[PDB]
Write a protein that binds this ligand. Sequence first.
Ligand SMILES: Nc1ncnc2c1ncn2[C@@H]1O[C@H](COP(=O)(O)OP(=O)(O)OP(=O)(O)O)[C@@H](O)[C@H]1O
Ligand SMILES: Nc1ncnc2c1ncn2[C@@H]1O[C@H](COP(=O)(O)OP(=O)(O)O)[C@@H](O)[C@H]1O
Ligand SMILES: Nc1ncnc2c1ncn2[C@@H]1O[C@H](COP(=O)(O)OP(=O)(O)O)[C@@H](O)[C@H]1O
Ligand SMILES: [Mg+2]
Ligand SMILES: [Mg+2]
Lengths: 188, 467, 310, 495, 128, 127, 48, 62
Amino acid sequence: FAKLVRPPVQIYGIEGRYATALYSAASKQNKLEQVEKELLRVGQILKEPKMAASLLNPYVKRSVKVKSLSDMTAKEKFSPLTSNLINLLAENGRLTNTPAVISAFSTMMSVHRGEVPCTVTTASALDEATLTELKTVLKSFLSKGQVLKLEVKIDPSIMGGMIVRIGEKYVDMSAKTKIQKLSRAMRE
Amino acid sequence: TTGRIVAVIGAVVDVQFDEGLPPILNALEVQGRETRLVLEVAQHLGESTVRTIAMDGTEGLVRGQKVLDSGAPIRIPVGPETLGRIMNVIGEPIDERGPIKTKQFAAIHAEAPEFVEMSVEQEILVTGIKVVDLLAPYAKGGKIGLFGGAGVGKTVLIMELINNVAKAHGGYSVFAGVGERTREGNDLYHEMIESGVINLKDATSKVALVYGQMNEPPGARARVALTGLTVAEYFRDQEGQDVLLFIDNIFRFTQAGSEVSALLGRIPSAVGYQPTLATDMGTMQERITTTKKGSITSVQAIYVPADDLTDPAPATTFAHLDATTVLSRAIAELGIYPAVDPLDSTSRIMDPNIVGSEHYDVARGVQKILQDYKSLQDIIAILGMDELSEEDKLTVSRARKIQRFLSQPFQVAEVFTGHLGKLVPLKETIKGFQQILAGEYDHLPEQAFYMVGPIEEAVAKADKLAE
Amino acid sequence: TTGRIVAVIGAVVDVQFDEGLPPILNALEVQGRETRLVLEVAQHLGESTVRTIAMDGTEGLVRGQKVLDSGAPIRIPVGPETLGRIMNVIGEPIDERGPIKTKQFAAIHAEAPEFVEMSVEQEILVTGIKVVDLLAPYAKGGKIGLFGGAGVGKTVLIMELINNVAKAHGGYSVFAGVGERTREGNDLYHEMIESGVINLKDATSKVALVYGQMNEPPGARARVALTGLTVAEYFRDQEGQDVLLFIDNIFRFTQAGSEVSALLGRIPSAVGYQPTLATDMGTMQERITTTKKGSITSVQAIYVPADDLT
Amino acid sequence: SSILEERILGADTSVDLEETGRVLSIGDGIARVHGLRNVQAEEMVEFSSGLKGMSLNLEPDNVGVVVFGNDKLIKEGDIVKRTGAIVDVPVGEELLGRVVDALGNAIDGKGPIGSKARRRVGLKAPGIIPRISVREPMQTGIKAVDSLVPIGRGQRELIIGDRQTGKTSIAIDTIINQKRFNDGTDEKKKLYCIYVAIGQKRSTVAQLVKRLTDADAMKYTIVVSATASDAAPLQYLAPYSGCSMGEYFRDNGKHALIIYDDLSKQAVAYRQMSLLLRRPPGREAYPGDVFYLHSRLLERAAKMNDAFGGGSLTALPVIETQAGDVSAYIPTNVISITDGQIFLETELFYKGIRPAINVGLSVSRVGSAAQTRAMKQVAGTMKLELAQYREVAAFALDAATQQLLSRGVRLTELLKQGQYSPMAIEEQVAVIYAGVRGYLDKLEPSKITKFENAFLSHVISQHQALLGKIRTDGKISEESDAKLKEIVTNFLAGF
Amino acid sequence: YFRDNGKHALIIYDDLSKQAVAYRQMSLLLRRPPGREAYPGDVFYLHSRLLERAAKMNDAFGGGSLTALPVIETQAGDVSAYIPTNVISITDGQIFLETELFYKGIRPAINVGLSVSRVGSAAQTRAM
Amino acid sequence: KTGTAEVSSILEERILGADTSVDLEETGRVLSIGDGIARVHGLRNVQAEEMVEFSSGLKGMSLNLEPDNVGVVVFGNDKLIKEGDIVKRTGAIVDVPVGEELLGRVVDALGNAIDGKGPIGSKARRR
Amino acid sequence: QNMMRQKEQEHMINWVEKRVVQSISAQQEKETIAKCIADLKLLSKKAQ
Amino acid sequence: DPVQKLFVDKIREYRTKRQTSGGPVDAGPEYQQDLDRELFKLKQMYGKADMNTFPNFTFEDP
Ligand SMILES: Nc1ncnc2c1ncn2[C@@H]1O[C@H](COP(=O)(O)OP(=O)(O)OP(=O)(O)O)[C@@H](O)[C@H]1O
Ligand SMILES: Nc1ncnc2c1ncn2[C@@H]1O[C@H](COP(=O)(O)OP(=O)(O)O)[C@@H](O)[C@H]1O
Ligand SMILES: Nc1ncnc2c1ncn2[C@@H]1O[C@H](COP(=O)(O)OP(=O)(O)O)[C@@H](O)[C@H]1O
Ligand SMILES: [Mg+2]
Ligand SMILES: [Mg+2]
């Protein structure tokens, strides 16, 4: 068999398996950016109410699905890779979970260019000065080449402090956890 | 090559390679361990992924470690430098006396001898055990099986065989203890050291030892048998010398193979056993053969789970042995030892043209009378012996005398019994049983025969009891 | 929070929450039923779905019905006003005699008293019956098998034990009729009313009856024993007294557990019983003990299948 | 009060950067955790609710984590933090006298465990070189066990029998009897007992701890209780925790004794775990693994040689057989792992013959080795005489036959014993001596028990010098034999 | 319908083992977890929620009644099978019909040792 | 419902329009060998119970004809087959030689002499 | 004595947790965020 | 050491507890009933003797 180039991040399931196939296809020929473009365009196309309702009915011959998808991919002049991928999904019958596929690819593309995701959870909003200094410190965690991709979030369950997630690493400075730790340690 | 671990379930590790995969049965080294953990390939899942069985504890394996292909299957040191040493499955020495400095290694997954190499000569092997010699005469150069439940005599019997046969032997010997007590292996080691069979300061050792004892993960237990087969195959071929190969307990081979066959994603066979039970056993037992280049005498102790002889494991192994010896708990509960069941033990050299006519006739008369008594037992157990004809009473008396006379005291059971161990020559056995069948001893009591050597001792004990 | 019934397979209902799932063993109330159907959570399938076992018939459940998460395991009234009142697993009164008025509510999924709370001296409950108290004495906080089927005096013996314990110790009694024939349950109720252990007028009943009928889905017959233990645990802890707890039958408890486990799709154990037979029995039997506040003495009618004690 | 405020201070609150995963699905006691990329196999992860779990399966996309508690305290979406250490338990002498649960969390009150060292429950048994033959005797204080089926230090006996035949009682008497050694001067005879309670009623263990405390026997005992209510992955783990707490002593030159009670209720917890993992059931629904489970656990009861400290770890697994079927699956799995066995008949027990050892089937495959020489002298004769008595007891003529019957009945009456009444070795020697040499053949069998009692009272009162002579010189010399003979004759005279 | 209108009914299911077989077929084809003898987990609920409708209403509800006489076939007199025991633990008696007695003249072959009626003589006319 | 041949190594060939270069009618590639059974992708024209020949001289018998792969059974030890090996048809239902030449020969299950006396000189073959 | 001590202890801790959950609304958020940000800086310094 | 807000918070709240403990604070009747029952079981296990009465047995002879 061929030596498909391993994507940076590994995804699993049918979604991630089609996504790995597509990433290895595009990486050869170095067509990642344009392939992602056509993927995020089919993302909008397939949401069309007519196509969305037509592709979920199982009582239309699969050949009808493939013909319609070939039409809609020839109209947009998609790269041969994306047209082949969509025809493949129609043949195999997995297009019902296309949004999981393309989404996975997006993830598999972010990890390529270093968009190491993060997440911050607080009990209230954050002043832009505080948020900016937070971004500056979080940038120190990463490596060279990587760039932070922050995502603020708000929850009331945690009272004070906040919770920070940096890819895998995770630090819980909430007041909830501190209160629980104090109560357990003192009780025990 | 260099792959990376992608899953670790029990003793089954799925590894992924980006360059060429290693062919099935290869060995792989998990780089980055405090010891040597060898993973033996077994499947090719697809996606340049292989599924391997670990030959050591897989605790501490992180998804994503590096695994380095060896290029050849597990290769163990073989030669005259393994005599007196101890080896684990992957062939490392575990006796703390330095490396096994041989010239030549052997892969443990060789192929069975071809049909155009099998030898056919059959010759009786005399062991000094009355029942074995009389009813199931062992054949020199053929497989032998000791079928037993738990706690019936398989190991005391295989130790008696070790002593009798090996100590009076000229050729080499290999003891492959697979899946059995560790303290027993230590006691055997320190018992052969004191017998001079193993020499720690010379080159006059006669016995190699390989151990996969029961503390080892399923991966190791399923392959130590192959290591023993290899160490013995070498002495058979590259020396042209007679070898003795004792294995205890061979059932652990198949049991371990089934413990690590649910994880390989196979549909379980009859009793949870692997679907490949018969073929896995065959590819192993078909290398333990006497051929035209050498002669291996194999003595294998087969556990019989939950005392079920129709279990798939013993039921399958019955077809690979020349002579079987079914030790039964029913007899052992009567105190008779060795507990051999006379009417289940068989041999392929119970031929009047091989063992002569007097031997064959005596053995068959013993079996006929024991079978008659067994048939009577159903009535005897209810209507007592007071409801049998006179010929039947006489038959029962002879049958009980013979059942007792088959019992013998072993040398290795002195510490248990205290009685002195006896070797009964074959002629003495035939003579004694011929006399008991003729009726020369209808006046003695049964107990005069319990745990005695030749019939002279039986007469002496009867005299002692009469006073 | 409200989820939506996504699947309904026999007595197993799969609900889909959207904000936050309910921890396992919680009780969910299906909205839209004339009666009150309670689903007990059993698994967290993922994708915010939870598989649950129904306490009543799941006929008529649409795929989309709203299901309100109660917020705690099945909770029942455990006052001293239960005495003389029949109630079913979910706590409703099944004697059509008016609501059970109590100021206390107890969740039926508790845990065994910790090691420190255990009492160490082994006492002897005095039942007042000569043969029982001489040859086979009963122990406080101990389990007592009761063999013998019908026609031998099982019900009369149960009533006598109830009376004697309530009279010579001041401790009430609970009767958890797991897998109870409706005919036999009604007969027992009327025998008790006649014999005075239950009294419908003067509020001096000595028995709290709990009935898990034989026509209820397995998910209900497997939990009624826990409702009985909940009431009796109240009488032990919050009222500090010895209690009697009759369980007729105890085999039907294990059988109900077996059917529930099969429904959920678990590999049956040795002889078709659930894999969790040992711990299913342990969690229940281990709450019948003599702690430092009181004791529950359980008399468990036992049926031996196929006359096989193994 | 302010002590509580101090309790507040000194609590570790420093936050750390730690890997984490998110639970996907919890049910059947196995959680599926997503993430945990750098998690080792058999690692100990910790859920957000304070629970602990063992990382069992490392599948490519998730991690199967067996929860060591009630899986009702685990949601979906919870957070799982890897603690970066294979499943560990605390070990040391700080545990002696403490009732720790399967993970070393004291369920005793009495403050926390002040342990400073941790072992891995999943260690490996000693190889073939470290071990040395069993040499020293383990004194059970039970006449039948100490005389007929002795035990050594490093041996792993089995106690097998039905419901309520006195297995726990033998275990407890063995634990209690070690009190005398654990007070003497030499550390070479001190035994540090351990007792693992698996799948047992919690009240039973509470009363057992109370009894052990009455007999002052908790100064050295550790009770590791994974009782009936505790989740299956705790009953499966408790034996390994106990075996580690014992391996600590064994590897630090001391002597330990571990009593798993029962091992038939660990294999049931393991069967639950497996069947809930969907593994293919085998014979009796047990997984094929159910052997390796016990073999790996009981292969650690070793006896290290002097070049490895010289410690030892005796093991006394307790198996329970339905209807006394010794040929069931688990009983034979364990009968082929151990170095002996003590069969406790349920009909001898119902005859009042307690303890109910079935001396016909009981055996100890180190036996005469590691037995006090005095007991050997006295008890070899008893073994032969009991053998002869059993050979003939199938009907109840001549002088020798009736003599065998009478002597055997006397010896059977002599071997009975009472609960929580262990006897020093010299006392057993004296009693069995008075029994076998023939100074009881005239006394009625029914009185043999009473005699015994009275005799002990006399011997322990007047002739403590002789018993000290026997104990010090572990052998009955000729002069000692004569003194014992005259003592027995004189005492019997007063009847 | 007759029970709830002051009338008395008597329903005879013949057999209730074949309803169980039909239900088992339905389940195994719907792919529900098999269980013992391949019977789903509801072969008790199935029969219990059927046989529990044989009642005797009190006068406030009409006084009607509904008896039931489920018929079960046992293979080789094996009454410890799954369905036979399920339906034996639900009902108020049983009338065993052994064939050994059938062929030696005793017809109806009602084995009167094993037969029982937990209701008993409470439902017998004073003369009988 | 994940197809066997829905691996990435195959979907990639499909995606980048390269499947046309290889023959997927009278030839296939071993997706997964293990325990003596090969799954083969290709061989769209292989008959049921037809014999096929691996790229190492080993033969097999295509038993399962599933929609996307073929379950082949190896008449030998699969130690030599590797993922990606080329399986090529033989064209004929599995058949064995016959005749009077076999008389007195210890032939193998497939008709190959294993007595070492030389090849079987048979003429006709029977399914 | 022992019973009273322990019971008062648990009651005290319940009252104290009531007090802390009440006072958690107190405005210290800014200094809290500052100190935790500094702590993040320390963690990152140790990360490399 | 004081920088951690939670430590100082607990410290000050407990200080307030100590000063308010001029008498025990926030008993609540539940407190009294619990005292009643637990003391009742305690004395019942022990006996009906006084709080602090030094008694005697007033021995006798056979
Ligand atoms: N040596 C003895 N002498 C007299 N009675 C004994 C003796 N040993 C045990 N018993 C009695 O047997 C009863 C139960 O024994 P024990 O609990 O030790 O058996 P067991 O096998 O541990 O029971 P289980 O295993 O079911 O807990 C006890 O009440 C005890 O009094
Ligand atoms: N020949 C014999 N004489 C006396 N006793 C024996 C004899 N063979 C076995 N036994 C007894 O039976 C037990 C069985 O042990 P062993 O045979 O070593 O293990 P296995 O279960 O593998 O057969 C021994 O410990 C011994 O007490
Ligand atoms: N102590 C007793 N005195 C008089 N009759 C008794 C006694 N015990 C049992 N019986 C009789 O035995 C019969 C058994 O019925 P009962 O025990 O009430 O139901 P079940 O047989 O279902 O337990 C009763 O009708 C009763 O008349
Ligand atoms: Mg053995
Ligand atoms: Mg016990």
